[PDB]
Design a protein around this ligand. Sequence first.
Ligand SMILES: Nc1nc2c(ncn2[C@@H]2O[C@H](COP(=O)(O)OP(=O)(O)OP(=O)(O)O)[C@@H](O)[C@H]2O)c(=O)[nH]1
Ligand SMILES: Nc1nc2c(ncn2[C@@H]2O[C@H](COP(=O)(O)OP(=O)(O)OP(=O)(O)O)[C@@H](O)[C@H]2O)c(=O)[nH]1
Ligand SMILES: Nc1nc2c(ncn2[C@@H]2O[C@H](COP(=O)(O)OP(=O)(O)O)[C@@H](O)[C@H]2O)c(=O)[nH]1
Ligand SMILES: Nc1nc2c(ncn2[C@@H]2O[C@H](COP(=O)(O)OP(=O)(O)O)[C@@H](O)[C@H]2O)c(=O)[nH]1
Ligand SMILES: [Mg+2]
Ligand SMILES: [Mg+2]
Lengths: 432, 432, 429, 429
Amino acid sequence: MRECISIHVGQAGVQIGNACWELYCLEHGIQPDGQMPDSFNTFFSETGAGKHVPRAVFVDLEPTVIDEVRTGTYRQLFHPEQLITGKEDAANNYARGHYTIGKEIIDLVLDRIRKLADQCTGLQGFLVFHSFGGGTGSGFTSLLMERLSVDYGKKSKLEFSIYPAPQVSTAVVEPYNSILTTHTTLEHSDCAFMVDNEAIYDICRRNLDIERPTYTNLNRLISQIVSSITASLRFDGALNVDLTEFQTNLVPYPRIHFPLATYAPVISAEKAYHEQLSVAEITNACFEPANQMVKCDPRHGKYMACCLLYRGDVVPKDVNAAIATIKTKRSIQFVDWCPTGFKVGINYQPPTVVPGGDLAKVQRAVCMLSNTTAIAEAWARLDHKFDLMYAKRAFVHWYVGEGMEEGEFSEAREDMAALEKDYEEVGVDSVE
Amino acid sequence: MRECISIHVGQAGVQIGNACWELYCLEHGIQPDGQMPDSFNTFFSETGAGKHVPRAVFVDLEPTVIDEVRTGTYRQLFHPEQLITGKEDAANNYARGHYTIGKEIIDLVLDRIRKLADQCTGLQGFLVFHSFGGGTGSGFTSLLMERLSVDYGKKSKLEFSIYPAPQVSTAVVEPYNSILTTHTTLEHSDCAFMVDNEAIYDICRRNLDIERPTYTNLNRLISQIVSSITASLRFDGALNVDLTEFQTNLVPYPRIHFPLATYAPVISAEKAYHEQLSVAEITNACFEPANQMVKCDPRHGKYMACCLLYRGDVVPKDVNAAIATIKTKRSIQFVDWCPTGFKVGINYQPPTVVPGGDLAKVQRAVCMLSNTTAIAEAWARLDHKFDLMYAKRAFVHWYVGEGMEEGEFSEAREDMAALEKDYEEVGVDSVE
Amino acid sequence: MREIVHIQAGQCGNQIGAKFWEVISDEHGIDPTGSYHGDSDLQLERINVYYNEAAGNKYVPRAILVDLEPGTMDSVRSGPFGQIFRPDNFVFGQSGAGNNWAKGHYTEGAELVDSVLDVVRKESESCDCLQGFQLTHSLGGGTGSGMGTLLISKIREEYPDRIMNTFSVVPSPKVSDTVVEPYNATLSVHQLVENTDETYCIDNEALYDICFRTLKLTTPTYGDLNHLVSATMSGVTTCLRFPGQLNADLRKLAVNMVPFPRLHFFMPGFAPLTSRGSQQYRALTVPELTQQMFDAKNMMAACDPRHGRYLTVAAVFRGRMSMKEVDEQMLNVQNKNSSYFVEWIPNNVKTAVCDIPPRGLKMSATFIGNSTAIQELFKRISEQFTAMFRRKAFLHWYTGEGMDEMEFTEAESNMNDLVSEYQQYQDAT
Amino acid sequence: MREIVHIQAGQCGNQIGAKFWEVISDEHGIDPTGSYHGDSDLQLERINVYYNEAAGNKYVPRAILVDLEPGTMDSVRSGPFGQIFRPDNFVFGQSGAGNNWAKGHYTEGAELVDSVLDVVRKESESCDCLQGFQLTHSLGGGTGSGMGTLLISKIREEYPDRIMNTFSVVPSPKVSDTVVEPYNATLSVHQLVENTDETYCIDNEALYDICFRTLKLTTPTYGDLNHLVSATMSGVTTCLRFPGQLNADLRKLAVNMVPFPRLHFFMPGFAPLTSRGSQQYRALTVPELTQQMFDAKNMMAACDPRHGRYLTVAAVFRGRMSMKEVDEQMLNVQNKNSSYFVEWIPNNVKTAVCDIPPRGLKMSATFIGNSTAIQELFKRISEQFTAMFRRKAFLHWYTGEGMDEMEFTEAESNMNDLVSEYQQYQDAT
Ligand SMILES: Nc1nc2c(ncn2[C@@H]2O[C@H](COP(=O)(O)OP(=O)(O)OP(=O)(O)O)[C@@H](O)[C@H]2O)c(=O)[nH]1
Ligand SMILES: Nc1nc2c(ncn2[C@@H]2O[C@H](COP(=O)(O)OP(=O)(O)OP(=O)(O)O)[C@@H](O)[C@H]2O)c(=O)[nH]1
Ligand SMILES: Nc1nc2c(ncn2[C@@H]2O[C@H](COP(=O)(O)OP(=O)(O)O)[C@@H](O)[C@H]2O)c(=O)[nH]1
Ligand SMILES: Nc1nc2c(ncn2[C@@H]2O[C@H](COP(=O)(O)OP(=O)(O)O)[C@@H](O)[C@H]2O)c(=O)[nH]1
Ligand SMILES: [Mg+2]
Ligand SMILES: [Mg+2]
């Protein structure tokens, strides 16, 4: 009875959830009606009849993408008081997400979370799935992370964000929305995992040999990471891990809680043969700089801590041989103050295959959750884009007129520059 | 567990490999799908299923001849990440092979070799199959032999080159490409075997009685030599030999490592009768100057060392009688400082017969690997052709404009002339 | 008479104990139901040492199972021999450890230890004459470290004269399961040096080698590794559960192995260990037991005994053997290896001989050795502890639960007061 | 009592030993499984000299098998009598020899010899009273030369008083298997003159003749050649494994055959040897054994004994025979061949008589002869060595592994210090 509810905010939050909750139903044989022909009691609640509902709260400010769920195939699965919508979207605006529109339905969502918190007793933590780009995914999330630390506090809050790509940027005001939502979540979130879009396009083009992927094919690869993190709660393993245990082993200082996720093996079905895929093979595919799912070269920085989450037919002795060769290599380097930099987790259940997909049925798979200082180069260029646009005071007249102090930008930039030198404090070595 | 990977470079490399890997599959019953209805673990790697893949890396700069493999009969056998191609060919140009085009995919091939080096532990050495004529077979090989001595170093690197014929020359700039690729491989290769095209036409016309052979029929006779060298690794023999043992017994000085291969018996099926083919008969067919596969008269020079590789139903006593008569003849002469000039190897397995071929099912066969100074006449005429074309500065404007120092020809010719007098140092006798 | 209360803690202490009671039940002939299906009558002579007779010829173990999350207890009751434990003994909390020592010994330790000791005190007042406790935990995690050392501090206040031994799993040198495992080990050794009487240091890395170098196993799961530890836990009290020629117990091996009250960290060893297809070529006789104990590829701790000195050595033999051939082999290894022992203790080999082998073998031994080669074990933890503490990294998860630097500083200073003793007596004369 | 540890090395030393243990097992009646299926009771009286009794009436050989590549060990364990060796004794490396002495004695020799001597020392401490070792190798290759002479230099430091004899395969005069075999022989004889006690020089060319001139074989494979060597290796210790009238061992044949501590290179001979269809026309009596030993077509070294002088001669007879008829034949060959022996040693024929013949024959002998006719053996190697070294050919494969010319020069000078002794005592008076 280790229960855990998950919150999906924004359009990027919902379309990940339609591929996550597609995956959880297939692992336990759950029909789209909620019926089925125990261990899965964490992410469900069996009612008086034989029907199971998800412990999820979808929320969005625009009614477009929620009506995909209310009319699509997974229609009878969700409780209709969970699917909270709004009249108008925040529309690429942190101020509408946090001051104007987000203040009108924040009392309704907290009422729905508290009705899902009372029927559980082993509630470990939350799972907020949002994006730094849009207005709802950033503004309404930064409002939501404030209201959870006031009410609950002790529960470990995790986030699977969508970090903006260095080159591919859909919205123009993504440097504005990323800084203002990271100034706010820095005090409240405990571990915010980073997943970038452009690095998944680099994997689907090279490894899977798909020339034209859509957002559906990206949401399949994201939900495999979401499954392998919460795989130890839903099944029995030889060496389990819990959501309280991620924030202890990967967040050394309270200001540095931005890891990056990496999944392996990602290969096609015609390439699923011709190679045996042992754990000594697929572990080095995680630390390879071409298979990381954030566009950041890991050889520029140092690994502070790493978390390998094995699953499948995995031998515990061969894991010990696989990690030991990584610490003998020369391109992979750790920080000087951390001699013991691994969190190891083995689960028995092999990863399942969604039909109509592109990955093949394998026998084992590795999810790596590594916290490196190579992300410090990525925060520098995001602060470089923010300083260029704000020097001309571009796009400020939208944010001032929607109820925001004009000097709050200058308070956000000085706090982010303080985060910038904190990686410089870590990266240096010690005397004697 | 004595494993060995093989590298096929250029169009002449690949079309030998399509007749080599045809032959290795038939010796062990391997289907073209890789399935089969142990000892063969050297040149294969059995996966989790019942499928075997070759330990080969085909590489070429043009996508023409690689698409024969990706569409032909042996399609499901090779791992599709091994078949490394390129956009445009080097097109009879050492500079495009080593400076312009070869520098763009040399990082991709070394990544694929290192992924085949890590899953082996008894890795003896390499097998580079290239040609001195073309741009990719010479330029990309000379780049590749530099990158292997930096990374690996201790492993015995063998080469099965295609030496250009004295009269039949397809490309015009073969004297340019042969010198520039021998100036580079002289420091890195350990033993580079020589096989000439024109001498195989002389054998197929006279012995086999085929008036019109194609390149397919030449690649059958080459792959019989490739099989008989690596026959001692793949089976049990009465007196084995390894790939580390070829470089010790045939390379006396570090500048002289150009032997020549000779195979016997090469007879037709209708002539497979009428003669008994004992080991005292077929051994003298190797030292006969009409059956050597390099157009060089061996009576002009002296044999420095020889390596006989018997296979089949071979009696060890009758080998001793067969070698002893050769040292009593007068046309065959050895160098004065080498009284013991034989390396003997007996294997039990008879040579198999590929269907649709021209050679017959025999009971025994001999592969001779002899290192003579009769090749020193062949290096003289190749330096004579190089001095004629370079005196008029013909074809130099292609090589200068593709990123090459103009004086590098004058550095290549002075180094090759130093190789020329090294055979003169060997051929003289001693005082007292 | 002379009963033993078994206490388990953490994820690892359950999965050792769930294999440990599978070995004890196969020595006494107990089905997974709980009845008796034995053949001889020596198996029920001393059945009270671990089993309490229930109503209707059923025997239930005297086990107390502790965890901070119900996940591991969900697999123990559902597995084999999980229907033999009494359901009142499953004491679990709903919060969760979090893999942290502060949540194990301070915050969620105090909310549970008052409910565990209602079960410990009930089992202790049911026994006739209590011998001593035992504990199975791991120093890496949070429940086996924090909650595990909290129970020992409460027991030793109530029961001072009773012995208290722990089967710890000391973290490996090369790989590391927990990132903050130097903090969870340094704050645990500070509790064990003042509260236990003897402690068995076991490394995971030394067990992966024996399954790979000696037993030759292709896929050793934790069912294969924890079967070797459970054979050694039964091999210490095997002179108590069965009659013998020279009998020992948990007190004779506590007196003769502990010369100073701080030096009580051991290393265990088991013999014989044969491969699968090589158990017919090997002459399984009495001097084969001796040569397989003392070599360094058979210790269960990742430390070479050649670097140190053996202070005291206990050998617990099983099966019908002769006493001269024991004293022949134990003396000859003390003459040819005359420098690797210590000088100021004459004749430092303890002998104990039982009569009944384990199920399957003809005879067997058990090595309980003390050494100064475990100073390499604490010079590696204290090096990793001061490498992390000088940056004050991973410290706000500990300081935020009511903890100061004096808790850390007096812990690391106590460990360097332990290293300076093993380095002292290694060079004394 | 008086046990012998057998050491094998190289490709050739395995394929002699794999035939050698097939002959010993047929004299003691051992199946390929490892049990006993004998008929008499004299076969188990001295079974401890080569076999250790395992558990369950199985006997495993006291053999130690060494190679630098796993190819030859793959065929020994899979062939007949390959399931009798203990699998721990198969000590093999993954690198490979390369047919080079520098990779045998310097580079890959040192990475393996520390793991071989853990097996040598374990077998030597298991024997009651050790007699002496024996080694089977070849001077041509790299493993039998480099790794083979490295083991002798490490053993003679640990065990000085124990005897150490090698069954070498000296390379043939006419044909040559290895191109660089003068380098691999000259750098091996320099090690054998200061580390062994007696050495049996065997040439391949002398074995191809006997299968062609005496036994009349159409297709002699190496199973036919190595069966003659294995009959001579058993014929030396046959007075130790069975009782006799005048008993000898590996020490009596070491004292009475070695007059000077550098002169210990022998030549072996075996009798009787009959053809297939001519073993009925021949009178197989006692003087037929004598006339078949001393003639030059029966020596196992490619050198004519008429050119030199016999210093010492050992004849080891087997089977129930009479002692007068031995002393009749051994004296008459010393009177008519009075010039071919030496003058300053009177009565230089050693006699040893066993009681049990080999399986199949009625009686047999074994000739262990020393001579100065093996100065032709070293004047042919030192001629081929100085013919290659004066051009410095094939030298960068040796110099590139940490080796100088002083290693070569002191090796060739030691050999010419050995030729100048056999030429000295051939003409002394
Ligand atoms: N991973 C992923 N990212 C997506 C997907 N769809 C959109 N995004 C990203 O989401 C960002 C745009 O923000 P949105 O989430 O659509 O905006 P919102 O939070 O819903 O709120 P509004 O802007 O008011 O509609 C960009 O960075 C897109 O790349 C998807 O299916 N998967
Ligand atoms: N033995 C053999 N030689 C061949 C074969 N086909 C071509 N050659 C030789 O290869 C040489 C021509 O160069 P190529 O090897 O085709 O050139 P390349 O290295 O593949 O690269 P490019 O010149 O860029 O196309 C000539 O010496 C030909 O005789 C073949 O099937 N067998
Ligand atoms: N030998 C062994 N060690 C284990 C096993 N399971 C976990 N461990 C060890 O236990 C440690 C992890 O601590 P854990 O008990 O799971 O955490 P806790 O529940 O918070 O105390 C690591 O050192 C693991 O190697 C097991 O089955 N066998
Ligand atoms: N009599 C005999 N000689 C052999 C046999 N096999 C190899 N040889 C000899 O051994 C020498 C080759 O050495 P080899 O052992 O293969 O090389 P190494 O493994 O590096 O020591 C040559 O002199 C061969 O004549 C065999 O079965 N019998
Ligand atoms: Mg949106
Ligand atoms: Mg080409």
